[PDB]
Design a protein around this motif. Structure first.
Motif, PDB file in Angstrom:
ATOM      1  N   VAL C  58     157.586  55.268  82.203  1.00 18.15           N
ATOM      2  CA  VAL C  58     156.988  54.339  82.409  1.00 18.15           C
ATOM      3  C   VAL C  58     157.501  53.206  81.800  1.00 18.15           C
ATOM      4  CG1 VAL C  58     154.748  53.023  83.556  1.00 18.15           C
ATOM      5  CG2 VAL C  58     154.926  55.904  83.584  1.00 18.15           C
ATOM      6  N   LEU C  62     159.581  49.642  83.359  1.00 19.38           N
ATOM      7  CA  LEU C  62     159.285  48.405  83.512  1.00 19.38           C
ATOM      8  C   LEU C  62     160.151  47.475  82.921  1.00 19.38           C
ATOM      9  CD1 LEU C  62     154.999  49.130  83.856  1.00 19.38           C
ATOM     10  CD2 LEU C  62     156.887  48.417  85.408  1.00 19.38           C
ATOM     11  N   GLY C  66     162.463  44.123  84.759  1.00 20.49           N
ATOM     12  CA  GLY C  66     162.173  43.156  84.022  1.00 20.49           C
ATOM     13  C   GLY C  66     163.545  42.199  84.218  1.00 20.49           C
ATOM     14  N   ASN C  91     160.114  35.364  78.878  1.00 23.91           N
ATOM     15  CA  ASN C  91     159.236  35.459  78.019  1.00 23.91           C
ATOM     16  C   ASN C  91     158.888  36.902  77.831  1.00 23.91           C
ATOM     17  OD1 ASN C  91     156.423  34.822  76.632  1.00 23.91           O
ATOM     18  ND2 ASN C  91     155.899  34.432  78.457  1.00 23.91           N
ATOM     19  N   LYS C  94     155.111  38.239  77.596  1.00 25.07           N
ATOM     20  CA  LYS C  94     154.941  37.723  78.672  1.00 25.07           C
ATOM     21  C   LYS C  94     154.869  39.415  79.353  1.00 25.07           C
ATOM     22  CE  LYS C  94     153.119  37.336  83.230  1.00 25.07           C
ATOM     23  NZ  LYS C  94     153.096  38.237  84.199  1.00 25.07           N
ATOM     24  N   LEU C  95     155.520  39.591  79.361  1.00 19.84           N
ATOM     25  CA  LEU C  95     156.302  41.333  79.488  1.00 19.84           C
ATOM     26  C   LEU C  95     155.360  42.378  79.396  1.00 19.84           C
ATOM     27  CD1 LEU C  95     158.792  43.483  80.927  1.00 19.84           C
ATOM     28  CD2 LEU C  95     159.981  42.933  78.818  1.00 19.84           C
ATOM     29  N   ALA C  98     152.187  42.493  79.972  1.00 18.01           N
ATOM     30  CA  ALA C  98     152.094  43.406  81.590  1.00 18.01           C
ATOM     31  C   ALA C  98     152.294  44.885  81.565  1.00 18.01           C
ATOM     32  CB  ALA C  98     153.112  42.815  82.678  1.00 18.01           C
ATOM     33  N   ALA C 102     149.796  47.752  82.047  1.00 18.67           N
ATOM     34  CA  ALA C 102     149.692  49.360  83.483  1.00 18.67           C
ATOM     35  C   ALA C 102     149.802  50.423  82.964  1.00 18.67           C
ATOM     36  CB  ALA C 102     151.157  48.761  83.870  1.00 18.67           C
TER      37      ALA C 102
END
Ligand SMILES: Cc1cc2nc3c(=O)[nH]c(=O)nc-3n(C[C@H](O)[C@H](O)[C@H](O)COP(=O)(O)OP(=O)(O)OC[C@H]3O[C@@H](n4cnc5c(N)ncnc54)[C@H](O)[C@@H]3O)c2cc1C
Lengths: 492, 492, 492, 492
Positions: C58, C62, C66, C91, C94-95, C98, C102
């Protein structure tokens, strides 16, 4: 979160309970206690409170007391008391109920003792030893039964007590032990008690008093003289007085096989060919330490030659955090001695004030009819470990028994000293009062009392106990093992 | 040649006999003992053997024993014993006859002891001092009666004991004392024992047992509490248990006069004004030393301001070679004290080792129902003597009595201590077995046992005596004479 | 009362959860599940949900997604899109946030799955094997830590997954695994990923896209060609395209020691002498089965030559009631394969409908940039176990990449068949779409699809997947291991 | 000798070329192909390569790809990508120029294929039938124009495809079709696409991406739902996601007339009465077979009642040796169908194995945003054909889009089944990857896969395609044509 237990105890008997109480209330330790029942009675007989509370001390005393009334009623006539002789009925069913209610009273108090004492918790089930720091609780004694608890433990105390020893003869299933006797539905008309121990004697008197009409209590023993271990002359006397009170004492005899009759009665054949029919056959041939259900092999705990658990002067075993007290040690199977060992184990571990229990000069009784009181050594044992031994004897028939109609009830009193310094090494009483008398005597031996301390004390008249202060001269001696009356004039 | 002895004993009582027997058998001296009868009973009651054997310790013990059977028959119902309750009744004549046989047997044995022991001769008659070295034996207590013998004596020992004190109220002719109570033709239906001492109490229990239907024993004592000089708590428990058995206790009451009724019963009128109708009035207000008939004035033997013969710690009177022991000295009026006083007197005079009777820490008893056993000091006195005093106490109704039905029979066991070291100053018991328990407790005090020596001893399970080895913390204290539930502050 | 568990599961990963769910809701069995955390992240990284949910499938997808945006932004220009070039900022902080949100979303759903499903209970802690029917929970992986649970078990499932293999070179503590990379506070400027496995490749692309300015992602491998195990031509191509996208692929190299610089950066020395400085050194040299913390020696569970747990075609071990699934078996370390093994273990035991999982012709992907899709055998493996092998090849540069500006992104497609019956033995794709394309291909191999089935199907135009239907003639053959273009005209 | 071939192909399109290439390279035949241009664009648009290459599949795919970048740039913010949002803008001229280069390259390659392949010759001009065995090539579509060539043909293949249908409303002069949209000088600010088909939809997305600021794409369709013939649920989800991106969908609307405004924009007036002002009006209401210029009447080639050339299952017309394929037959208007129709036509005529194109279960796509992939029957049709019908369904918003921000992008995956056996009748997908996923799904239906063959397959984690192997129970059924949430009763 809740961690382990500063101490877990298997068996909530006389010793078990004195150790968990002195720890939860005296040292704020977490304590667990595992016993197989909450109330007296079958199927396990012994339950919360120990053998002493359920199938020993307490209920035996109550039943002996009731049995003494047979003699009381008989002897009252000498003092002018009359009442319908043929109307007397020894109601055994009424005695057992009164007993059961007394025992259950104790069962509940302990039952509540756990419910309002933090750090002290009771776990119902069978306790087996898993690791050297885990106790296994199971629904039954079967090692393959369902589990209900696994108690993580810092210290482990083994206090499972002892169990009646049964012989290996055909038909032993038709026999009972001291356990089952406390719960006979009716009093047996004919009973045979096997063995010469204090249990066989005490129950012989009980059965003898409550037996229905036409009954005979027969006590058999495989050797010559019953009550092996107690003072010699007291042995032969108690034999005589048991005979007087109607009990057939059948010595040098051992059961070899037992069968059932057409009416349920037991048919007993002896090793000498003689047969006897009885309604009850009670085995009291000894008590063995109760270790089978513990799985002591899983940790490698060591056992003495006798099936007992080995320990030192502090109740410690080979496994570092495993201790054993009470009858499981195979030592002095007494209740005050297990309470002393138990109270002493705690404040040597959780109180760093190490104090061990003394196993010598201990007072014990034998609530037979007549009763026995002892403390210290007997003469023939003093011989094998003391230079010069003095024996003080005195056997008067008590004051009241010329009137009572029981001339046979000869009261006896022996004192054993080291003739060197006159220190009292033993004191042995036979006759009513012996148990209550000896207790204060145990304090004297703890004080190294010499014989002069005894006969120089002013007596309480009229009593039987005063005879201990009335003996000023030995009746015979034991010098280097030999027994002669006069002490040969040849010193050094 | 003839009639020239080493010792002449006036009074073949407890102290007298012990004195003479030891003198003649232990030191081969020519001894003569004088007494007014060879067998118990009227008209002189006391006889060969002393007050104890003929109208004292021995007979009452048998009679108390017989009265205990009223409680036994009733308590046995709790242990399953059944029988027609309405058919029970006590035969007062069979009790007396049986008691006479027992006492007579001692009388018979003590005689023949004289017949078979050389140097020990008995003289029937009334002894009195004629000079410093001559005892005269006359035919009656009157000096005008015929002389039977004149005995030359190197040493004279006065051992005539004591006699019932009878208050000089009008109607005293219609009263009796302990002496005649031992010989009543029938048990009194209504009886009034007078006095708060052990004699009045003990007898109250006997009469209460044998009273015919619709009887009522009544004990009165001019002060507020019976058994002065005993431990207070015991005093008050024995009062409760007496009232619990049927005895009515009239305290702060003293009879003022007695008068005859038409039927022949008695009409007592107390000081306070009340009145009671009873069949017998037994006086037990005390006993006075029996110096009346000894002619002490002919020699100058000085009497104590309290009325006894004055003696130092070796029983010596002001007159050389004349000695006194027993009740006649008006100290501790107990048989073993006189005996010990006699045995010591002989050792001192006819031996090479002075011996004097220790009069403190003497264990005595009181055969009420239940009985009393005591030894040493009681609270009050200890607080007058020592700095800090600790009181260990324990009181309960034993289990055996919660079943018997006699729930009032609360055991009691006090222990007085000097808290400055722990030594036991006294012990006080109430309940079954108390007299027997206390005997060895007298050996411990002679050994200066400490409270720790008792609780550090292992007990005998199960017995009343255990309670002594179980009191570990004081129930209250006595600092500088004042009572308080706990100590002062910190100390150490 | 509450008994044991019809099944206890150690490790709540992909396989663990599919077995406890299909049992609590499908068969009403009592089920327990032990995992060492409830939420993703340090210190244990893997937690409730397994490696797939926390530090695998997972979060990797993601992050790759990105990372693809680096290529997207670049390629949009070919299609007329403009925007400030120097203002773009990848960034990383920021990744990761997120991503974390999740993952935690999944952490909670499972967290609630347990709280409303009777028979299904979650136990936090470390699970070690005690007896062959007891699981030990402990606060930490240390076998000597405090216990919080002991789960009696009827069946035991081992699903602890796998762990990153670390080499034994000095300074390995300064290295991280796939675990720690998911939680780097900042994106590393210079990163070295060690190994040739799909993990090293997938993270090389991720780091390559989010690296700050001036960064270089260096991937090293100890042998000649990366991605050992995948089809040959796909290997060399992916190497080429990784190089194109800026990644330095450094083959035939192995780190020998790593040290710290004055600024915290790692100094890496290789076995060939060459040195390289990086901010992060990530080890992805293989995954080993995770068995050390299980104490499998206490029951004697057998392990394969590789450290994995041995099992059969039903996931059973030597110990009768102990099973193992997932990466702990050392087989196909895939999530759908552990969910299949887990769902299959249950309804063969608790459903008596035995169905095992097929381990052949399984579809897998490799979300690199560009991605890879495979299923079945590769050509050189088909050779060693098949008479005649046919290979279908086709490597067009995709439609859109003449405009995109990424001419290097050559898409590849290989099919491998048994030339006897034309059955497809493998299918190997390189290029965007490969993962989604291959999934439907796996169904074809489950249907024994021959090559004719493929090129006789009408294509979906315009797509890359249509190239699988456009290959009608082999490019070379593998006959009895040898590889020649033309298939020699010499039959039988 | 000269101008005498085996096959003459009118139309170098998809079907035509495949036919000729196979004929000339696979069977060494003399082939001639005719088309009106060699490169894309006006005035004839279609050219060498067919509609697909020049104004169809190829160009739109590139333009859709370019429009996808509007969503990518926006969705990248969720994955940590930052940049000045206000600086983004699409250059419509750079998109067209880039698309021209790509299409031109194919044009260049297909030519030179002729130059290098013997027996394959191209003829620039307008082809038409002069007799049963003569194709004439004239200089323009007009029959009066000059003859360039007369080609003798043993076989003639009509492959001229289709042409945009333009409704005959007033102002139609001011509208365009798909052809001219591929060449607009600038992107329309306001645009109105007309038709509910895939062309109108796909183009709506392109214009929506490149519209200048303050633009508005408007799609209208005379019926109530767009994309007739597609799965209904997908029809309605694509409508929602289109509206979610900016496109306004005017259903139950049909333009009635267009007129010019002063500025030069358009003034549409629909039937219902409303009006819209837009800069462009693109017509995509359908496409009609291009039979206009072929002179079919000179030979008697019969047309279908729907307007296409009538052909049997082997592409044979009523006239012997004349064949038709592709859009001109008005069947399935898809490139791979014509290609396959051509390759089969050649195998049949110039081989020894008849082959006919299976027209059922053809997987097609629709490149909206997100795209559509489908294959087989849809619910409604299956219910008209089979007894019991099962519908497996799955619809969610993928995780990657909950982060990107495009939360409307809900994936969809239906599966239609015949519940009487389980065979898959159709598959319908919506979302990213749908066109690629569906391709292999066409191989499975050719293999008659069953619903079990899909869920019994192991999936590829993590992908959209997994959803196919995860629907195990029907979401609802279709019994005897009626829809119902569950089945009838029991059966079996
Ligand atoms: C008939 C009789 C009369 C006696 N009279 C006297 C007397 O007058 N005076 C005297 O001092 N002593 C007397 N005793 C002895 C006295 O009862 C014991 O010596 C005393 O109980 C010892 O204490 P203990 O705690 O070691 O044993 P116990 O008190 O017997 O402790 C054993 C307890 O542990 C339990 N237990 C056993 N195995 C397990 C297991 N695996 N798991 C869990 N629980 C278990 C048992 O059920 C029992 O409750 C008598 C004994 C008998 C049989």
């Amino acid at each position: 979160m809740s961690k382990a237990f500063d101490l877990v105890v298997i068996g909530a008997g006389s010793g078990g309970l004195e150790a968990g109480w002195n720890a939860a209330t005296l040292y704020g330790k977490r304590v667990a206690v595992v016993d197989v029942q909450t109330s007296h009675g079958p199927p396990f007989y012994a339950a919360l409170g120990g053998t002493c509370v359920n199938v020993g001390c307490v209920p035996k005393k109550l039943m002996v007391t009731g049995a003494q009334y047979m003699d009381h009623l008989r002897e009252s006539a000498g003092f002018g008391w009359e009442f319908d002789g043929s109307s007397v009925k020894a109601n055994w069913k009424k005695l057992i109920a009164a007993k059961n209610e007394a025992v259950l009273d104790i069962n509940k108090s302990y039952e509540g003792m756990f419910n309002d004492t933090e750090g002290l918790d009771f776990f119902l089930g069978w306790g087996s030893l898993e690791s050297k720091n885990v106790v296994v609780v199971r629904e039954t004694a079967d090692p393959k039964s369902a589990v209900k608890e696994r108690l993580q433990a810092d210290h482990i105390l083994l206090a499972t007590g002892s169990w009646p020893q049964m012989p290996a003869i055909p038909g032993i299933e038709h026999c009972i032990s001291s356990n089952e006797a406390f719960y006979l539905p009716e009093p047996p008309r004919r009973v045979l008690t096997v063995g010469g121990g204090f249990i066989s004697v005490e129950f012989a008197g009980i059965f003898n008093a409550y037996k229905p009409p036409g009954g005979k209590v027969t006590l058999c023993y495989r050797n010559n003289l019953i009550l092996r271990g107690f003072d010699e002359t007291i042995r032969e006397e108690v034999t005589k007085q048991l005979t007087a009170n109607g009990i057939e004492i059948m010595t040098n005899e051992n059961p070899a096989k037992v069968s059932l009759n057409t009416d349920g009665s037991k048919h007993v054949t002896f090793e000498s060919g003689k047969t006897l029919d009885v309604d009850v056959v009670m085995m009291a041939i000894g008590r063995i330490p109760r270790t089978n259900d513990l799985q002591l092999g899983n940790v490698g705990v060591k056992l003495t030659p006798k099936g007992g658990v080995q320990v030192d002067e502090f109740s410690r075993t080979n496994v570092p955090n495993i201790y054993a007290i009470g009858d499981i040690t195979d030592r002095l199977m007494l209740t005050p001695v297990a309470i002393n060992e138990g109270a002493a184990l705690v404040d040597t571990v959780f109180g760093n004030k190490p104090r061990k229990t003394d196993h010598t000069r201990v007072a014990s009784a034998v609530f037979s009819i007549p009763p026995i009181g002892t403390c210290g050594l007997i003469e023939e044992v003093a011989a094998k470990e003391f230079e010069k031994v003095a024996v003080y004897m005195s056997s008067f028939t008590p004051l009241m028994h010329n009137i009572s109609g029981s001339k046979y009830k000869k009261f006896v009193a022996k004192i054993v000293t080291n003739h060197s310094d006159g220190t009292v090494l033993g004191v042995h009483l036979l006759g009513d009062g012996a148990p209550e008398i000896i207790q204060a005597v145990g304090v004297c031996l703890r004080l190294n009392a010499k014989i002069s301390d005894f006969y120089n004390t002013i007596g309480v008249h009229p009593t039987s106990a005063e005879e201990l202060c009335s003996m000023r001269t030995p009746s015979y001696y034991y010098v280097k093992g030999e027994k002669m009356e006069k002490l040969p004039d040849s010193n050094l």
